[PDB]
Structure formats: C-alpha cells, structure tokens
Short mmCIF file of C-alpha atoms in Angstrom, two decimals:
data_model
loop_
_atom_site.label_atom_id
_atom_site.label_comp_id
_atom_site.label_asym_id
_atom_site.label_seq_id
_atom_site.Cartn_x
_atom_site.Cartn_y
_atom_site.Cartn_z
CA UNK A 1 97.14 90.32 115.26
CA UNK A 2 97.07 92.25 111.94
CA UNK A 3 96.26 95.65 111.07
CA UNK A 4 94.31 96.32 108.01
CA UNK A 5 94.48 99.69 106.06
CA UNK A 6 91.20 99.90 104.18
CA UNK A 7 90.83 102.27 101.04
CA UNK A 8 91.75 105.90 101.04
CA UNK A 9 92.98 108.37 98.65
CA UNK A 10 96.46 108.14 97.28
CA UNK A 11 96.50 111.91 96.00
CA UNK A 12 94.94 111.03 92.53
CA UNK A 13 92.68 108.10 93.18
CA UNK A 14 90.20 106.98 95.73
CA UNK A 15 91.04 103.55 96.45
CA UNK A 16 89.58 100.24 96.57
CA UNK A 17 92.64 98.29 97.62
CA UNK A 18 93.31 96.96 101.37
CA UNK A 19 96.52 95.91 102.96
CA UNK A 20 97.45 94.20 105.99
CA UNK A 21 100.31 94.60 108.54
CA UNK A 22 102.16 91.82 110.30
CA UNK A 23 104.24 93.27 113.20
CA UNK A 24 106.36 90.39 113.54
CA UNK A 25 107.40 90.63 109.90
CA UNK A 26 107.16 94.46 109.82
CA UNK A 27 105.64 94.37 106.33
CA UNK A 28 102.43 95.10 104.71
CA UNK A 29 100.89 92.94 102.17
CA UNK A 30 97.87 93.42 99.94
CA UNK A 31 94.58 91.42 100.48
CA UNK A 32 91.31 91.31 98.48
CA UNK A 33 90.15 94.91 97.41
CA UNK A 34 86.83 96.28 98.38
CA UNK A 35 83.97 96.07 95.80
CA UNK A 36 83.81 99.85 95.78
CA UNK A 37 86.44 102.68 96.02
CA UNK A 38 86.02 104.20 99.48
CA UNK A 39 87.98 107.41 101.02
CA UNK A 40 86.91 108.78 104.33
CA UNK A 41 85.60 105.24 105.15
CA UNK A 42 84.88 104.11 108.72
CA UNK A 43 86.18 100.64 109.48
CA UNK A 44 85.35 98.29 112.70
CA UNK A 45 85.88 94.76 113.41
CA UNK A 46 82.89 92.34 114.81
CA UNK A 47 82.72 88.65 115.21
CA UNK A 48 85.94 88.19 113.04
CA UNK A 49 84.91 90.18 110.19
CA UNK A 50 86.05 93.73 109.06
CA UNK A 51 83.22 96.22 108.21
CA UNK A 52 83.80 99.23 105.71
CA UNK A 53 81.14 101.44 106.53
CA UNK A 54 80.39 104.66 103.87
CA UNK A 55 82.98 106.64 102.44
CA UNK A 56 83.30 108.31 99.07
CA UNK A 57 83.93 106.69 95.86
CA UNK A 58 85.58 109.65 94.00
CA UNK A 59 81.93 110.79 92.81
CA UNK A 60 79.24 109.75 95.24
CA UNK A 61 78.98 109.88 99.04
CA UNK A 62 78.42 106.29 100.04
CA UNK A 63 75.52 104.45 101.85
CA UNK A 64 76.95 100.92 101.26
CA UNK A 65 78.48 98.82 103.59
CA UNK A 66 80.91 95.61 102.98
CA UNK A 67 82.36 93.05 105.51
CA UNK A 68 85.72 91.32 104.96
CA UNK A 69 86.14 87.63 105.96
CA UNK A 70 90.02 86.83 106.37
CA UNK A 71 89.30 83.06 105.95
CA UNK A 72 87.77 83.56 102.49
CA UNK A 73 89.86 86.65 101.82
CA UNK A 74 86.64 88.21 100.16
CA UNK A 75 84.22 91.16 100.60
CA UNK A 76 80.46 90.86 100.73
CA UNK A 77 77.80 93.76 100.81
CA UNK A 78 75.74 93.84 103.78
CA UNK A 79 72.86 95.86 104.58
CA UNK A 80 73.67 99.58 103.74
CA UNK A 81 73.15 102.76 105.92
CA UNK A 82 69.99 104.84 106.05
CA UNK A 83 72.19 107.85 105.20
CA UNK A 84 75.12 108.40 102.77
CA UNK A 85 78.21 108.98 104.98
CA UNK A 86 81.59 109.79 104.32
CA UNK A 87 84.01 111.08 106.90
CA UNK A 88 81.96 109.03 109.28
CA UNK A 89 83.45 107.49 112.56
CA UNK A 90 82.56 103.94 113.29
CA UNK A 91 82.98 102.05 116.74
CA UNK A 92 81.71 98.63 118.05
CA UNK A 93 79.98 98.33 121.26
CA UNK A 94 77.60 95.29 122.55
CA UNK A 95 77.88 93.48 119.44
CA UNK A 96 76.50 96.48 117.36
CA UNK A 97 78.35 98.72 114.76
CA UNK A 98 77.72 102.35 115.48
CA UNK A 99 78.11 104.88 112.42
CA UNK A 100 78.44 108.37 114.08
CA UNK A 101 78.19 111.53 111.86
CA UNK A 102 79.64 112.28 108.65
CA UNK A 103 78.74 114.04 105.42
CA UNK A 104 76.19 112.93 102.92
CA UNK A 105 77.09 115.07 99.95
CA UNK A 106 75.35 118.46 101.03
CA UNK A 107 74.81 118.25 104.61
CA UNK A 108 77.32 117.38 107.65
CA UNK A 109 75.47 114.98 109.94
CA UNK A 110 74.74 114.78 113.59
CA UNK A 111 72.87 111.47 112.85
CA UNK A 112 74.04 108.14 114.42
CA UNK A 113 72.95 104.55 113.06
CA UNK A 114 73.61 101.33 114.84
CA UNK A 115 73.95 97.78 112.80
CA UNK A 116 72.86 94.45 114.36
CA UNK A 117 74.43 91.65 112.44
CA UNK A 118 71.88 89.18 113.67
CA UNK A 119 69.35 90.87 111.86
CA UNK A 120 71.44 92.48 109.33
CA UNK A 121 69.99 96.00 109.59
CA UNK A 122 70.53 99.66 110.66
CA UNK A 123 68.38 101.56 112.93
CA UNK A 124 68.66 105.27 114.10
CA UNK A 125 69.84 106.11 117.48
CA UNK A 126 70.11 109.39 119.28
CA UNK A 127 71.80 112.11 117.16
CA UNK A 128 74.94 113.85 118.39
CA UNK A 129 74.51 117.17 119.90
CA UNK A 130 76.80 118.80 117.33
CA UNK A 131 77.00 118.10 113.74
CA UNK A 132 80.21 116.21 113.04
CA UNK A 133 82.09 115.07 109.84
CA UNK A 134 85.70 113.98 110.08
CA UNK A 135 84.89 112.73 113.33
CA UNK A 136 87.11 110.43 115.61
CA UNK A 137 85.31 107.70 117.44
CA UNK A 138 86.31 105.16 119.92
CA UNK A 139 84.77 102.95 122.72
CA UNK A 140 85.68 103.21 126.62
CA UNK A 141 83.96 101.78 129.52
CA UNK A 142 80.77 101.12 127.42
CA UNK A 143 80.79 104.65 126.04
CA UNK A 144 81.15 105.84 122.49
CA UNK A 145 83.14 108.99 122.43
CA UNK A 146 82.85 111.21 119.40
CA UNK A 147 85.95 113.47 119.35
CA UNK A 148 86.28 116.56 117.05
CA UNK A 149 85.17 116.89 113.60
CA UNK A 150 83.80 119.52 111.46
CA UNK A 151 80.13 121.01 111.93
CA UNK A 152 79.79 122.64 108.45
CA UNK A 153 81.49 125.90 109.42
CA UNK A 154 84.04 125.30 112.12
CA UNK A 155 86.41 122.65 112.90
CA UNK A 156 85.43 121.18 116.39
CA UNK A 157 87.34 121.04 119.74
CA UNK A 158 84.34 119.51 121.32
CA UNK A 159 83.78 115.83 122.47
CA UNK A 160 80.47 114.20 123.56
CA UNK A 161 80.16 110.46 124.89
CA UNK A 162 77.14 108.22 124.19
CA UNK A 163 75.46 106.03 126.67
CA UNK A 164 73.52 103.13 125.16
CA UNK A 165 71.72 102.52 128.24
CA UNK A 166 70.20 105.78 128.17
CA UNK A 167 70.48 106.44 124.43
CA UNK A 168 71.70 109.80 125.10
CA UNK A 169 74.86 111.92 124.08
CA UNK A 170 76.69 114.12 126.92
CA UNK A 171 79.47 116.71 126.25
CA UNK A 172 82.53 116.01 128.10
CA UNK A 173 85.88 118.05 128.11
CA UNK A 174 86.85 119.46 125.01
CA UNK A 175 90.22 118.99 123.12
CA UNK A 176 92.74 121.41 123.57
CA UNK A 177 93.33 121.78 119.92
CA UNK A 178 90.29 121.90 117.23
CA UNK A 179 90.64 118.73 115.28
CA UNK A 180 88.97 117.58 112.15
CA UNK A 181 90.15 114.42 110.25
CA UNK A 182 91.47 113.18 113.61
CA UNK A 183 92.36 109.63 114.43
CA UNK A 184 91.21 108.02 117.71
CA UNK A 185 92.06 105.01 119.49
CA UNK A 186 91.87 103.61 123.14
CA UNK A 187 94.75 102.23 125.13
CA UNK A 188 95.00 101.57 128.93
CA UNK A 189 91.80 103.17 129.74
CA UNK A 190 92.91 106.55 127.85
CA UNK A 191 91.55 107.90 124.48
CA UNK A 192 94.28 109.17 122.04
CA UNK A 193 93.41 111.93 119.57
CA UNK A 194 96.05 111.79 116.84
CA UNK A 195 96.68 114.63 114.32
CA UNK A 196 93.96 116.05 112.30
CA UNK A 197 93.24 119.53 110.95
CA UNK A 198 92.42 122.83 113.07
CA UNK A 199 91.33 124.88 110.10
CA UNK A 200 94.79 126.55 109.74
CA UNK A 201 97.20 123.76 109.72
CA UNK A 202 97.54 120.05 109.81
CA UNK A 203 98.57 118.90 113.17
CA UNK A 204 101.14 116.41 114.49
CA UNK A 205 99.94 117.15 118.05
CA UNK A 206 98.75 114.34 120.02
CA UNK A 207 96.16 114.57 123.21
CA UNK A 208 94.98 111.84 125.56
CA UNK A 209 91.96 111.79 127.57
CA UNK A 210 91.49 110.40 131.04
CA UNK A 211 87.73 109.77 132.04
CA UNK A 212 88.71 109.72 135.57
CA UNK A 213 89.92 113.25 135.58
CA UNK A 214 87.80 114.26 132.63
CA UNK A 215 90.60 116.16 130.98
CA UNK A 216 92.96 116.15 127.89
CA UNK A 217 96.69 116.18 128.27
CA UNK A 218 99.21 116.68 125.34
CA UNK A 219 101.63 113.61 124.70
CA UNK A 220 104.37 113.29 122.38
CA UNK A 221 103.77 114.61 119.10
CA UNK A 222 103.78 112.63 115.72
CA UNK A 223 107.20 112.61 113.78
CA UNK A 224 105.07 114.11 110.78
CA UNK A 225 101.66 115.91 110.56
CA UNK A 226 98.83 113.72 109.71
CA UNK A 227 95.12 114.47 109.13
CA UNK A 228 92.78 111.94 107.61
CA UNK A 229 94.94 109.35 109.44
CA UNK A 230 93.96 105.92 110.48
CA UNK A 231 94.85 105.02 114.11
CA UNK A 232 94.58 101.61 115.80
CA UNK A 233 95.89 99.83 118.86
CA UNK A 234 98.07 96.69 118.55
CA UNK A 235 100.25 95.05 121.43
CA UNK A 236 100.20 98.12 123.66
CA UNK A 237 101.20 100.28 120.71
CA UNK A 238 99.21 103.08 118.97
CA UNK A 239 99.59 102.97 115.19
CA UNK A 240 99.01 106.17 113.22
CA UNK A 241 98.74 104.91 109.27
CA UNK A 242 99.18 107.04 106.34
CA UNK A 243 97.07 110.29 106.32
CA UNK A 244 97.92 114.01 104.91
CA UNK A 245 100.89 116.33 106.02
CA UNK A 246 99.60 119.46 104.62
CA UNK A 247 101.55 118.76 101.33
CA UNK A 248 101.17 115.32 100.28
CA UNK A 249 99.40 112.16 101.00
CA UNK A 250 101.31 109.86 103.09
CA UNK A 251 102.17 106.11 103.09
CA UNK A 252 104.45 106.52 106.06
CA UNK A 253 103.45 104.76 109.41
CA UNK A 254 104.33 105.34 113.06
CA UNK A 255 103.62 103.66 116.29
CA UNK A 256 103.38 105.20 119.76
CA UNK A 257 104.84 103.46 122.92
CA UNK A 258 103.21 104.95 125.92
CA UNK A 259 105.99 103.61 128.41
CA UNK A 260 108.57 105.46 126.44
CA UNK A 261 106.17 108.29 125.22
CA UNK A 262 107.61 108.33 121.95
CA UNK A 263 106.67 107.66 118.30
CA UNK A 264 108.98 105.60 115.80
CA UNK A 265 108.39 104.67 112.29
CA UNK A 266 107.68 101.45 110.97
CA UNK A 267 107.27 99.86 107.51
CA UNK A 268 105.33 102.02 105.16
CA UNK A 269 102.34 101.45 103.31
CA UNK A 270 102.93 100.15 99.63
CA UNK A 271 100.18 103.12 98.83
CA UNK A 272 99.84 106.39 99.88
CA UNK A 273 96.40 106.66 101.99
CA UNK A 274 94.67 109.49 103.41
CA UNK A 275 90.93 109.25 104.53
CA UNK A 276 91.84 105.59 105.12
CA UNK A 277 90.05 103.25 107.62
CA UNK A 278 92.23 100.99 109.88
CA UNK A 279 91.43 98.06 112.16
CA UNK A 280 93.09 95.27 114.09
CA UNK A 281 91.98 91.67 113.40
#
C-alpha cells in the first residue's frame, strides 16, 4: 500500500536514494538506497520485491539489476541484463519481468528481455517493431503495451502490444500526441499515458486508451508539465511522481481521480526526481 520512488535525477546528481509514500499519512519517508545511482531506471514489483532495472549512473548506462526486500529494508543485486538499458520500460506479466527497449549509450534499442526469478536469468524475447527509449510500458489483459518513446531521430506517437503466447508485437492505435519520457499506468481497464515530451515542449496532457474501442481519448491534464515522470496506480488513483517541467526537475506529486476527472497535488518528494522509477508495494 506504499508508493516507492526509486532513483532519478535531481538536476545536479543522479540519485541512489529511494523514498516511500504512505497515502494514509500523506507523507514520504526515505528507505534504504540503491547500491548504484540510477536515473532513467525501470521499476517493477514481483513476489513482494521491488526490482530496479538498468538506468544511468551519471557515467555509464547500466545493465545491472537490484531487488528491494521491504522486510529487510535492503537492496541486493540479481542477474544483470544482457544489454545496458537506460530509459527502459519495465512491466511484470506471468511471473516474469520484461525490460522493453531503452538506450545502451550509443543505440536506441528495439530489443526486449524477460527475467525469470526462479532461474535468476534474463532471456531475449521478440523485439519491438520500433526502437524505443524513454518508452512507457504497462500490462493489460495479458498483453504488454509499449507506449511512445524515441527511436533515435523522432519522438514517437506509436504504440505496440506484446502477446507472450505468440511472442509477437503488434501495432495498436497511436497516441494523439508524440510522447517520449512518458509515464504509463493501467486503471479500470484503461491505459493512461501521462505527460512526456513531444520534441518541441514538455507536456501536461494526458491520454487514456480503451482496448475495446482501440482508441485514445484525452482526459484532464496535469497541473504541471511532466516528462521523465513516474506513474503508479494505488487505491483507484493514478499518481504522477516527480519529472521535469521544461524548466526544472520536480519534487511535486499529483494524483488523478477518474471519477472526478481531475488532478490534485499530494505531498511532495523530499528530493527532486526526474527519470524516476515508481512502483506500488
């Protein structure tokens, strides 16, 4: 029932710090830090553990992965990716962690790898049809959706979905707006694409995808522009954590109520964090 904000960039420093949000107290508290600084990190929850995948330590784009045990309040390294990946999208499906796309330091990636915690190993699965760093990823109805991103030359409005039973990606309806550094989460059978960067400006706009109609619709915009924003769903609300508003890196946090279709501010992070990974545990 807590939101964890993992790593990020405060405007000067790539962070190893981690903090947790308690909606009942409306308060953030620091927890144990990562072993390595990570901005542009992908985060996912599996088997009661938080996995921090890849990212950038201010020097090198990372293949390392570490896992957080809230009962020990400690991070431990697990098996590394086959490819260095910052700006990577991460989602959990059928007991596996998928690492989608990202940037290895010279190339924007279309490759995808999956982690099996039983074997503690990563293996490649089918690649994206499009290279995607800064990509948002979420799982809905047994499919993994890769939303937007940057292919090396263009900020993307395209969206594709992964079927693990066929080991195949398929294009679905594209966003109305190009978005890299976009935050994505799933709520009430819809995928929300939050903020991002369209190549011209950082965005406050938000779009929601309905798989039944295969179409995106705009919903209420954020109170502030946010790219590199972490997005997570808790208690029927969508939280947008941190990010970058085109001017500075943000410690502010807002929550979206789909019943009212409105965003409201909640308590801010102790630390400005763009390129932050967010997960609910």
